[model samples]
Target: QQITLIKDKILSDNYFTLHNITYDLTRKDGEVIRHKREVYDRGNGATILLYNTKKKTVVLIRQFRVATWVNGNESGQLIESCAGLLDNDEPEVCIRKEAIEETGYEVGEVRKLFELYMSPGGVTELIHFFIAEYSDNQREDIEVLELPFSQALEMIKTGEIRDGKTVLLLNYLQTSHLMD
Candidate 1:
């Protein structure tokens, strides 16, 4: 398969840039087709799950998200791992900064697992996933939930933890025996 860029038009240039792009896709059968797609670019991001090695628990945050609310989530509150955009920094540096600022945990030596495209169909984002062992600390602003690995798995089934990044990391921890 081959793809050729036909046109790219900027639709919005606010906090992020949205582009309406047209391209020509050629198949192996020698058939060429024109396609159009809208992609939102907000730069790449990084996400980290703070877990306890011996305790078998993970720390997550519950917060209201306006985008979720507008996109069909009734409550708009999501439980997610500590994540933020790279903002011109490296993935490791960005995640470490977000971890301390959001969870007040001094995360050290994060283990980078993999990179994933959260929404490849309509968004241009590649998120670096990582895991780190964390110590207990207190942050006053957000509600931090410490949950057992088993309970977090159950929450995913019950639609309580709807955040994709958080779910992916939690399932990875359980399936890979990393939760222990």
Candidate 2:
């Protein structure tokens, strides 16, 4: 049982690239078959949840997301952890930049918790997950809203926070004793 790539072609490329790949796969029974798969390549990304240990709070953002709206999210304004695509930079650098730009909070000494493939079925994106501490003294380029850990958890149950990455990170923290 083996796989061999026959061809890989780009269907479209702009903000992202759509690829059509043809391959040959040998089955367990020793028969070989050709297969085709369409993949969307948008590069990798990073996501982070900012928490304050002393204050027992988490900082998140509410933003307008068109994809969620068209895909069934009611308000189109979604709550999410600060995140961004890698943009040819390292995950740590990218997340630090994104946290400042999008969340208006400078992060320090971030921990690289884990990495995950958000949509492996079609999209090619490995998202690195991170956590960092935030303080009240940080400078803000935009407004930053802080919520208690318990309240954020409640919002997840009530469906106010709909971003998958955000929900996963929060639940991980809660179960890992990081939030307590």
Candidate 3:
């Protein structure tokens, strides 16, 4: 008797890739076995830290996040830096757009801080970090959703603001002397 070899075939829903997921298949010798691995394919994004020397402040947002401190916290919205998803474009441009939308600030000179994987084990989140300087010469359009930069920082210092990004930026500015 002869043991003929044949290539395995895939019978799948094909929804994984469509929904930003990576699927893996396993085989023993030459036959279909099982799925070996799967991963989330969340695209990259940009997180901009806007530092305005003219105003001596930074632009931030107060957003509600639920998965923060393990309490299933859906309240006490966090103060975060001006950030946004890549939107199938360059991180710098994406973040700059976020800066405008979130803070109503136009980015001038952009300095890349560093890139970090927000979570490597589960999610595919690559954060392109940037330290940008903005000129406060722009007019504030209240029609957009945003808050005062100074007021945001004050709340953070007084413990009234408990957002991850705000806390982080405050500390970073303090140590880096960017505020001064």
lDDT of each: 0.88, 0.89, 0.62
Candidate 3 residue lDDT tens string, 17-75: 21223333445555543332334555778887666666676666656655654564456
Worst 10 residues of 3 by lDDT: 1-10
Provide TM-scores for the models: 0.92, 0.93, 0.63
Where model 3 places Cα greater than 4 Å from the true spot, the runs are 1-38, 66-71, 140-168
Pairs clashing within candidate 2 = none
Residue 51 miss distance in model 2 (angstroms) = 0.5
Candidate 3, pairs of clashing residues = 79-163
Prediction 1 TM-score vs. true: 0.92
lDDT of 2 at 122: 89
Scored by TM-score, the top model is 2
Model 1, range 1-180, lDDT digits (tens) per residue?
389999999999988999999999988799899988998999999999998877888888888888999998887888999899999999999998998888888887889999999999999999999998887642354677888878989999999998999999998888878765
Clashes counted in candidate 3 amount to 1
